[PDB]
Amino acid sequence: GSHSMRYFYTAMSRPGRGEPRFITVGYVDDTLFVRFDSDATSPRKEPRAPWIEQEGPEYWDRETQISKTNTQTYRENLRTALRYYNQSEAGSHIIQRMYGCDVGPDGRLLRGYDQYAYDGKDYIALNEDLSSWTAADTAAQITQRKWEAARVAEQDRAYLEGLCVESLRRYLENGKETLQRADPPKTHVTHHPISDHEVTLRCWALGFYPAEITLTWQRDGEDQTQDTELVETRPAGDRTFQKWAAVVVPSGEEQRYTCHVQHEGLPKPLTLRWEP
Amino acid sequence: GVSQSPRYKVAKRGQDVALRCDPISGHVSLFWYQQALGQGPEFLTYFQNEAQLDKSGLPSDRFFAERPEGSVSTLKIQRTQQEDSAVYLCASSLGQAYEQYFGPGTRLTVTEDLKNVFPPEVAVFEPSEAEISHTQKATLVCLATGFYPDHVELSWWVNGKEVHSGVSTDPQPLKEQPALNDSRYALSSRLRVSATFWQNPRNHFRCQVQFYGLSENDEWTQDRAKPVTQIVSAEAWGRAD
Amino acid sequence: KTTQPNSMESNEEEPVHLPCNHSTISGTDYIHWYRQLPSQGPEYVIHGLTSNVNNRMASLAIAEDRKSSTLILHRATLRDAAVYYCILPLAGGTSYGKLTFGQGTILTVHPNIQNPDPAVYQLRDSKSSDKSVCLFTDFDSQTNVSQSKDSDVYITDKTVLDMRSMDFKSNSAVAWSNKSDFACANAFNNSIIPEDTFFPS
């Protein structure tokens, strides 16, 4: 029902080794569609999903120009951050930004985002009201006073209620066949002997979109979420995802364990067991 | 605020000049602009701290700009040409997109020969007898004529004290020889006081004109006085009559 | 890229509305206004995006479709006479804050001469014998002063005087020449002057 668009900024300073590196990636839900790297030869915004290639030449030039301007913008940010914290000009530091929007079934804005981190810690974030800012410390409060006087949030709100949702709707339609159709996971349970009295049962999910998934092992009907080994959901590289869940079980009791699979593409939640 | 030195610079064609800007302390962003007469300011170069990241506005590679320590900025124009003549404006801001604070500008005039440089002759004209009787007021008029280039600053001084109340000075000068490129200028000013302030023999009214021209650093081979940066003034004493 | 009128006139102590067109504005572009007083560096006045912004001297009013805006000065003074620039610094998402002014609305603020007393006066030089000057003064703001078409006759533009002790303002133009033919009675013949201009003989 709901969808989202995100842009991810990474600015990394490297004293002596040139200018700061600026990188940008765009996602619609869990699909990458656009990218930019400042260290590319003739740097510009590139397509990463076939449905974005439909966009005209005016799009790519303006997209590229924003990215090239950002390289300058975030070079200023990094230097300003140094003075704000009394840090030396010889250290490598990171600034991150995530911004985008969430839409409902009607294509309306659910909520908007504009969040900043410095060296992995919260710096400044746009409130859900799209009018005020949350500073994580006193250094970021300086930015907050700057941004309140300069009426920054207005620009944010204008984009999120206007261009953000408008462009997302266009992307969702142009790539409806992949973005709006969910891919069901292919599931199976494998058997791996460890000792004489202990075997690992591994519950697989393969080729699913979107990434959102829940895999829980159950014995006799009770949640085994403490004795479950769980790996992070991982990209297959073909835009679909992978995940598995493991549980060490006694020999001859494999039939007593159940794997519950929850995913958007599944008409009903699946329950699986080891097939001897 | 932002300051710039010098206010005025007269330069011989082919010589190098240096234009200095001292921005507001703690300002990351520094902008240079060029304002040619009858036009708005035009972007020249930009500094983010010590880094010159955009110089797309520079007319030629004769324009050398620096800001070595992230503060004081220098615009060096090598081998100055007639086209370089203009006002050069320095602006600094708290960051690239924040409000720009401008200096008072440097007025550069590039001339072919420094023999064209003339200090003003100044005259004061005493108020009309009919004005005093008809209006109860007395308008003195100052006349600065024959100066080149257009680098003056005229001021009125009443009893040794500078006055801005009741003063009007032409925004732009008149050309005495409009035909020629290095035309000498004329400029007028008005000081208006109430009649009895003029009707006082002990009262003292001076029209001072600060002319920016040459210095002892420049060389001079002509017979007439070297047209150095100087003050030229004319004064009128009040009259009981 | 913005367009604005070539010039604008207004009385002092009265509001000024400076219009600006920007029909190609991006949904995220800022409207900025700067101004330049005569012989001074430019200065920031105001900026906004969608909704109206307020100061105790200047306001910005932006249209619903955002295609145009207005710089409103509330109580315009003679000091406010300047050039006013309407700028879109981001230029539709292509620029970082560097300013493109570029063609603005020249302000003129006229003094409220409630008691006009138009007169041409002659002023003699405090030192030299020959030298003389003609002063056309105390006319109201309706009077225009034309430049002389003769090389040897000098007529200045009108300039506004402010005696702050008496709260008295007055217009004037100065005329002079080295001609023996030239006189104060004929000096301003090139201009349309009030029929009740006082000429001391």
């Binding site: 951050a81 704000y84 700057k146 620009q155 261009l163 | - | 292509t94």
Partner: peptide, 9 residues
């Protein structure tokens, strides 16, 4: 589509 944010710290 992105938008340009020229505002800094």
């Amino acid at each position: 589509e992105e938008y340009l944010k020229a505002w800094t710290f």
